[PDB]
Design a protein around this ligand. Structure first.
Ligand SMILES: Cc1ncc(COP(=O)(O)O)c(C=O)c1O
Ligand SMILES: Cc1ncc(COP(=O)(O)O)c(C=O)c1O
Length: 226
């Protein structure tokens, strides 16, 4: 039951925030509905969920159009998969957030292909913080350059950072890696305007991500199953 899992996930989030002195409202739950059918999302929506994350463009754009013509309003769609240049038009036309900005060219395409009547696309720069087997995300030493360039684009809005750490089961390493992301985030937050989103943490490391300072956790299986 999706509505029951939603409530169970929000309990774990609220628990973890409270334990480390944070207000539960500081942590946005982003329900990762990738691979989940539109019927399952519609249940989630009925249980009050409004923020949904998708890994693949055409799957995501089809859900977006579905709930639009149903006249369902007030949703927020986040593209959280790797973004190919040949699919950026659809992200720039249909999504509200994109978490995977890791090269300036792809961000300039999104800015150019973004219709003017829409609000700027909120974007996070993705950091490869600890995953040597991943080609996704920049190194921290490139952050200031990429952030400055991306910050300039008028149809985008730089909101913060995202990382998918390498899989880790030792809580100590989970926390140390997320702290590195929280430190970079704080550093960016001082100089850049409207930096308010650290997209970090999934079910396996949710506690350490929240204790380290994440503002948004990405939960998929624990909501929709597989
Ligand atoms: C294995 C795989 N999955 C998904 C995609 C992209 O999915 P979508 O067409 O929904 O954007 C690609 C792109 O070719 C792919 O190679
Ligand atoms: C970004 C992301 N978070 C989470 C999951 C799985 O959800 P859970 O956090 O419960 O492991 C997946 C895929 O289903 C995912 O792609």
């Amino acid at each position: 039951d999706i509505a029951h899992n939603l409530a169970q996930v929000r309990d774990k989030i609220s628990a973890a925030a409270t334990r480390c002195g944070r207000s539960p409202e500081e942590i946005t739950l982003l329900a990762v509905s990738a691979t989940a059918p539109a019927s399952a999302i519609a249940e989630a929506i009925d249980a009050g969920q409004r923020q949904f994350g998708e890994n693949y463009v055409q799957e995501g754009v089809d859900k977006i159009r579905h709930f639009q013509e149903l006249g369902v309003t007030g949703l927020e769609w986040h593209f959280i998969g790797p973004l190919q240049s040949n699919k950026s038009r659809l992200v720039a036309e249909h999504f509200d957030w994109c978490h995977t900005i890791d090269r300036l060219r792809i961000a300039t395409r999104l800015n150019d292909q973004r219709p003017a009547e829409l609000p700027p696309l909120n974007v996070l720069i993705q950091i490869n913080i600890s995953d040597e087997n991943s080609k996704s995300g920049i190194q921290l030493a490139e952050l200031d350059e990429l952030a400055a360039a991306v910050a300039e684009l008028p149809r985008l809005r730089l909101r913060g950072l995202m990382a998918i750490p390498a899989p880790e089961s030792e809580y100590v390493r989970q926390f140390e890696v997320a702290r590195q992301m929280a430190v970079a985030f704080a550093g960016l937050k001082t100089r850049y305007p409207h930096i308010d989103t650290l997209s970090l943490g999934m079910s396996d490391d949710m506690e350490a991500a929240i204790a380290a300072g994440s503002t948004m956790v990405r939960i998929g299986t624990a909501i929709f199953g597989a």
